[PDB]
Design a protein around this nucleic acid. Sequence first.
RNA 1: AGGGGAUCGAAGAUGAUCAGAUACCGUCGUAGUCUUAACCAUAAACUAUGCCGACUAGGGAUCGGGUGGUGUUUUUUUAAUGACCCACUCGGCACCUUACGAGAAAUCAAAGUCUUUGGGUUCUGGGGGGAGUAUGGUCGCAAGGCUGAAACUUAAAGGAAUUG
Lengths: 81, 120, 129, 87, 97, 96, 217, 25, 206
Amino acid sequence: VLVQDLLHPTAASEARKHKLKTLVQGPRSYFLDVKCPGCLNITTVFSHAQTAVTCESCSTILCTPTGGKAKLSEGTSFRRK
Amino acid sequence: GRVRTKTVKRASKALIERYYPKLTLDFQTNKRLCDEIATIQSKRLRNKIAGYTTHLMKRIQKGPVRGISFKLQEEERERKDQYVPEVSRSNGVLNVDNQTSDLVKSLGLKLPLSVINVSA
Amino acid sequence: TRSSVLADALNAINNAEKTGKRQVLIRPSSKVIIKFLQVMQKHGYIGEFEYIDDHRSGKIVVQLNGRLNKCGVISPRFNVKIGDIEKWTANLLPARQFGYVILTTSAGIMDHEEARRKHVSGKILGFVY
Amino acid sequence: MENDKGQLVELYVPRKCSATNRIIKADDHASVQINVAKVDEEGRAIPGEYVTYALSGYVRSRGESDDSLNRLAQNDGLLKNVWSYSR
Amino acid sequence: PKKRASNGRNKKGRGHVKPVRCVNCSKSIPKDKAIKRMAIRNIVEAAAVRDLSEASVYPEYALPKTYNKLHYCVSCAIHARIVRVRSREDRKNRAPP
Amino acid sequence: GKGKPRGLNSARKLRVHRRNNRWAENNYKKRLLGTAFKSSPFGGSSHAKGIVLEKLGIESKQPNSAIRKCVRVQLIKNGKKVTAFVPNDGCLNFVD
Amino acid sequence: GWVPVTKLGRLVKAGKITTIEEIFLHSLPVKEFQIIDTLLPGLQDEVMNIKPVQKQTRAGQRTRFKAVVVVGDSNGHVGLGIKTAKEVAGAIRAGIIIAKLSVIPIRRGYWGTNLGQPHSLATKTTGKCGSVTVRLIPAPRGSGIVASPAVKKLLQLAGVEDVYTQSNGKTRTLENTLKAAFVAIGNTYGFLTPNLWAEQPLPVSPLDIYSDEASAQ
Amino acid sequence: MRAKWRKKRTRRLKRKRRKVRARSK
Amino acid sequence: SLPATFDLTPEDAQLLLAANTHLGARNVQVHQEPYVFNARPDGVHVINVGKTWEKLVLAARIIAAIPNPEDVVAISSRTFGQRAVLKFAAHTGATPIAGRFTPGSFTNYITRSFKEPRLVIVTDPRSDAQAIKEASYVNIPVIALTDLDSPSEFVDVAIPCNNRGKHSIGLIWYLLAREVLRLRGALVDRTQPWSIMPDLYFYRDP
RNA sequence: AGGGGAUCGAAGAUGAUCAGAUACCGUCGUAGUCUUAACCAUAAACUAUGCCGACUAGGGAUCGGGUGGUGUUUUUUUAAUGACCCACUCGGCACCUUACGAGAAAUCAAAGUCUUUGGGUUCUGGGGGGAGUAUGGUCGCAAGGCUGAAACUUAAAGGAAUUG
Ligand SMILES: [Mg+2]
Ligand SMILES: [Mg+2]
Ligand SMILES: [Mg+2]
Ligand SMILES: [Mg+2]
Ligand SMILES: [Mg+2]
Ligand SMILES: [Mg+2]
Ligand SMILES: [Mg+2]
Ligand SMILES: [Mg+2]
Ligand SMILES: [Mg+2]
Ligand SMILES: [Mg+2]
Ligand SMILES: [Mg+2]
Ligand SMILES: [Mg+2]
Ligand SMILES: [Mg+2]
Ligand SMILES: [Mg+2]
Ligand SMILES: [Mg+2]
Ligand SMILES: [Mg+2]
Ligand SMILES: [Mg+2]
Ligand SMILES: [Mg+2]
Ligand SMILES: [Zn+2]
Ligand SMILES: [Zn+2]
């Protein structure tokens, strides 16, 4: 308070703020590859589905939509990039 | 009722304020004292006074009384001061929360470690 | 909706100072805002600032110091006819000896004293003391 | 404040806070001046010799007296850590 | 002028509550202003509980009190009950007992 | 920035509003209405010569008690009738 | 004889401070008036206005009397002092004291150009009080004082030669006006004009350098 | 007189001035 | 201007932790507090007692810095402080104020409680507020013990501590005494556990 | 204009009260109260406080959404759920303490960032009474709505706080 750096703010209390109210605004959502081990290849699903993403070959499911992030259907793996 | 007035209670205070190395718990002498050290124009009032400063004297003897602070109390206190022999070195070692010990590491040095947890 | 970009960042600078602060974060930044914020710095009234590149209009972090009393914007950017440039300073400046009416001219953004020495006039922006 | 031919005219060139550099004027009796004592080798605190500051009434009214002290004395190198310009 | 920022009594963001009739004088009044008491009390009373369990069947029985919500109209609430009148400041106090 | 339009083009709005709110001014309203010439027994003028009808004796207003001696006048230029005072001790003797 | 209580009441008689400007440099709170008497003998009283005020009493009506006074020299030191007291005289006895304590400094200056010995003000300065705001517009030389009878008098004593004034409120209520005018000229060592931007080495409190030459007994 | 009732006072008075003017049409 | 071995020491560290001087206030938390050091769950914020030390050193370095050690002033109406201050006040020139204060002590010479000091120290700026207020009516600096809820208006230099009872207070005061003696004072060199017991500076019983 | 018409109930009639008592209290009860079709367009229609944008200060609650956890509680076999709990974050209805600040004050996180007076925009007021009256216009079945003066009169009306 009264004296501090708006230019180099802690990566932590920066981290806890709104997605618009950061220093430089940017998102907080991510992407991931997903597998239902019947398969061999993987699909890339956005963290916030809106649409219930459907697998590549087998019309199986993959995830469900919510009020934000998606619920990955049951027997699934992932990794974030 | 026999509530002493202010002029009574006032005087007696200042009386004890500077003639405790004198007086007593006895009225009759405290009475004869007043004439010597303080000037008043009334027999009635003088006794009226002494009696109470005599009472005041009687209850100081068993612990201080407010208003009167003839400084002999502040310096009887000063030497009266002391206690301890046991401190807080025993037994075991300085028990701490995780973070408190995480604190030490993240600043300090050698500390007798003894860490438990906590719950909701 | 947001109406004079200058005006906001200007006021904030004031409310920072007033609140005893030493830095301000201003948004959305602009050519005008800079070239104004340039002139304050030039005469001692704030320190150094920094443009940050949001991929939008901009954010500016100002380092101010304490010398500054008031920085204000004139909100219908009136026209000043070189005779009238005296009338303005007179109206709103604390003394003859210091402080500036800053304004906008075809010959550039500048303080009336420089817009005196250059002998060009135009529209009026704001001021500093 | 000078004058035609030299001559420092106008009495009193008042103090100034250290965290705000506002003037500290006569009637502000809520202002302050904290002398830190210069020490030397082995504890001894060299008397009549200080690194000093002045906190304006306003600042310590708002309660910024403590933080601002920290920051000020630390960059004067007499507090190691305690403070962080980043937050 | 004004002498309550709650105003008369409790209504922020409603604009119309809807009234209740005064238990004591049938006066309408908005339920938010209602000044209410919860008359939970024994069916019997003081001395009758003995005479109750005395000339009765059952082991001590059970005894089930009689609850009703009361609504007062101020000039009713004031004329008797929870009201008194409070200092400029004691007024502010929302605490019950 | 309460009220008024600050725009550099709001000239008309502003000058118009003034025209309107000069009407709240009693001295102005009176002047354009020509209250002067229309009502008021004197034309627009400083004095007016008339003629005496009757000598009157007005009891003052409170908390003053008196009999204030004035005259009912038929204004020559004009017709209209006026009651007017006769100042100083006596004087009401001087009329008829 | 004096006999001063307060540390500062002592260092003063003890010829250990020469000018109030020290007190001002160190914002020291004056409590014993004879401090400013020795520190500034060129002061003269000025009773500005006297008005009656009344209170009803469970047994009595009480018409004590406000008196309002302005003490000062004509070299930058003024007091506005106000007290109601049950005798007129006494009110003017106490007020002057209060007005003495109250004494502040005045930053005065030049209209335009440098020349010699400030005739006017540093800046414009507004003092508001109750409903009256005074404004002090720095005037050119020989302008004199452009202010109502009272406020003019408050400035001459303040030792101010050229300054304009606007005012704004219920000015007829003098008490509130002078109290504002006072603030307006107690506001002139507030203004951080650029000449004052320099860093002076931050002086050391008299109470410490003559700490021995102070203290009780 | 009460504010209410004076508005009804004058209200009435108009309704009759009306009546009377209508006699003249 | 950094001494050398005026670092926090393990003998000191042990001291503070038995007193629980690093157990700063609960939910309660004045914004003005960076003296924190990570939240323990069960809502108890832990105090970075190195800073606690460093401040102490500073407070010392200012207490011993006023020409007459007797217009340096102790305060505590809080019973967990009265035996502390008094004892601090005996060991150093400073005049104590333990018990009720009494308002008009810095303004109004006309009183007999009257003091006129150049530095006021205090335990709990809540209960002692009168001091902290009245001191500001008359440019007096303030040294103060503080928890995480302590109101730091009109008090410079906080000593992030623990007014939650026990030994913390008593500790700190004894430590202040320690280092004002160790500063320009008849004491001694290195480690030097100091002849005086810290358990001295304590609130009594029953 | 139909329907409906329990209740309660302008008007009216009553019983008492009162000196009077067209009332207050009690009775009887018309219209009304509810609904459909169309009118009326008014309330202290109130926060007696325009809208959009910005900036300035602390605290715990709470409503909806979201995010975070080797959090509790739900047992089955761990989950999955759901309801809790803690932190953080938007945006809501509020209350708390502060007073940098504002006010004539009461009080105000806006009623603040105003003689250091300019972000944008709408609306109204300019002593009291005469008067929301007269007049014309217009809307309406009506009752009435909107628009809306002057002559004259007058030295005060008024606000907030203090003491009685
Ligand atoms: Mg009322
Ligand atoms: Mg409504
Ligand atoms: Mg009108
Ligand atoms: Mg006639
Ligand atoms: Mg003709
Ligand atoms: Mg007069
Ligand atoms: Mg006919
Ligand atoms: Mg019916
Ligand atoms: Mg009837
Ligand atoms: Mg009858
Ligand atoms: Mg009838
Ligand atoms: Mg209306
Ligand atoms: Mg309402
Ligand atoms: Mg808030
Ligand atoms: Mg969750
Ligand atoms: Mg009348
Ligand atoms: Mg009269
Ligand atoms: Mg009133
Ligand atoms: Zn699949
Ligand atoms: Zn009722």
